[PDB]
Ligand binder design. Structure first.
Ligand SMILES: *[C@@H]1O[C@H](CO)[C@@H](O[C@@H]2O[C@H](CO)[C@@H](O[C@@H]3O[C@H](CO[C@@H]4O[C@H](CO)[C@@H](O)[C@H](O)[C@@H]4O)[C@@H](O)[C@H](O[C@H]4O[C@H](CO)[C@@H](O)[C@H](O)[C@@H]4O)[C@@H]3O)[C@H](O)[C@H]2NC(C)=O)[C@H](O)[C@H]1NC(C)=O
Ligand SMILES: *[C@@H]1O[C@H](CO)[C@@H](O[C@@H]2O[C@H](CO)[C@@H](O[C@@H]3O[C@H](CO[C@H]4O[C@H](CO)[C@@H](O)[C@H](O)[C@@H]4O)[C@@H](O)[C@H](O[C@@H]4O[C@H](CO)[C@@H](O)[C@H](O)[C@@H]4O)[C@@H]3O)[C@H](O)[C@H]2NC(C)=O)[C@H](O)[C@H]1NC(C)=O
Ligand SMILES: O=c1ccn([C@@H]2O[C@H](CO)[C@@H](O)[C@H]2OP(=O)(O)O)c(=O)[nH]1
Ligand SMILES: O=c1ccn([C@@H]2O[C@H](CO)[C@@H](O)[C@H]2OP(=O)(O)O)c(=O)[nH]1
Ligand SMILES: *[C@@H]1O[C@H](CO)[C@@H](O)[C@H](O)[C@H]1NC(C)=O
Ligand SMILES: *[C@@H]1O[C@H](CO)[C@@H](O)[C@H](O)[C@H]1NC(C)=O
Ligand SMILES: *[C@@H]1O[C@H](CO)[C@@H](O)[C@H](O)[C@H]1NC(C)=O
Length: 161
């Protein structure tokens, strides 16, 4: 039911993806998304010490030099507080998910957004998730590159039939 999405390295894509490439990071968690989006005052303000505990997750914000904690706080506020109720189980979940992503190619990895590279003739995956979704920037009949791993389809498993 919850969508897990993450960023993948790509020097050709300015922002988080280029920063990950330079830092030798292959996969960095974006968020864990239940159906219910949080509205209003969070039940708890996510501190930098708390958010830093999700080891290896990079901020999408250039203002923190892609470290912590603008993306992390935004994720707790928009998707965390109203569904997890307390910060401790959400940090342990976000951190276990990132620790799993750092290991390499996940069991379920589907492209979300691409940057088509004319030189290598590949759909360089900039964001992926654990379930298939309509693509953005991915060119039809071109193979996908998930932080170096070549896959002919949009997922590292079969969807169709
Ligand atoms: C998918 O995403 C959902 C969120 O939409 C996740 O579900 C949440 O899981 C967390 C645990 O990881 C749950 O948090 C705990 O809630 C306890 C109270 O919950 C009551 O019962 C139902 C649950 O069916 C709730 O819906 C009600 O609102 C009730 O409040 C709460 O007591 C508990 O805290 C205790 O432990 C922590 C430490 O773990 C202490 O810090 C704390 O003081 C206290 O002792 C937790 O906060 C949460 O209830 C779940 N939310 C829902 C809506 O079900 C799934 O886990 C996600 N799954 C995957 C695979 O990603
Ligand atoms: C990771 O991705 C980045 C971005 O795509 C890439 O960086 C680019 O690298 C190229 C080559 O080193 C570089 O090109 C040079 O640009 C200067 C002018 O630069 C100015 O303008 C840029 C915008 O156009 C701006 O980004 C710069 O900061 C700067 O203000 C130009 O003078 C160079 O001279 C030419 O050199 C070529 C050969 O290299 C000759 O054929 C030619 O005649 C000129 O002498 C050259 O074009 C580009 O500026 C970089 N862009 C950015 C954004 O940094 C990295 O290369 C890539 N990393 C890896 C490891 O792949
Ligand atoms: O985790 C993230 C967050 C944002 N982005 C993209 O970077 C820009 C936001 O500054 C935006 O270009 C935004 O595009 P979007 O995510 O909305 O598709 C990422 O790539 N990864
Ligand atoms: O199920 C979903 C799918 C996407 N999103 C948000 O929309 C942005 C673009 O897809 C995604 O980058 C994400 O942005 P965010 O909420 O993390 O700011 C969801 O919220 N839930
Ligand atoms: C991490 O991976 C292991 C093995 O696939 C799995 O048992 C565990 O549930 C995963 N944790 C998360 C947070 O996805
Ligand atoms: C977060 O995950 C890392 C593994 O990358 C682990 O070493 C660390 O103890 C975990 N942190 C918390 C707060 O559990
Ligand atoms: C990134 O991915 C490539 C391809 O899977 C791999 O060769 C490389 O070792 C990975 N880097 C890290 C930091 O795990």
């Amino acid at each position: 039911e919850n969508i897990t999405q993450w960023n993948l390295q790509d020097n050709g894509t300015e922002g988080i993806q280029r920063a990950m490439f330079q830092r030798g990071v292959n996969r960095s968690l974006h968020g864990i998304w239940p159906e219910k989006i949080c509205t209003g005052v969070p039940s708890h303000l996510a501190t930098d010490t708390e958010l830093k505990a999700i080891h290896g997750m990079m901020d999408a914000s250039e203002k923190t030099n892609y470290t912590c904690c603008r993306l992390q706080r935004h994720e707790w506020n928009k998707h965390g507080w109203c569904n997890w109720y307390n910060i401790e189980p959400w940090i342990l979940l976000m951190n276990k998910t990132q620790a799993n992503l750092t290991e390499g190619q996940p069991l379920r990895e589907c492209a979300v957004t691409c940057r088509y590279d004319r030189d290598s003739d590949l759909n360089v995956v900039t964001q992926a998730r654990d379930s298939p979704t309509p693509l953005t920037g991915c060119k039809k009949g071109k193979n996908f590159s998930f932080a170096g791993i070549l896959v002919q389809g949009p997922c590292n498993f079969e969807i169709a039939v």
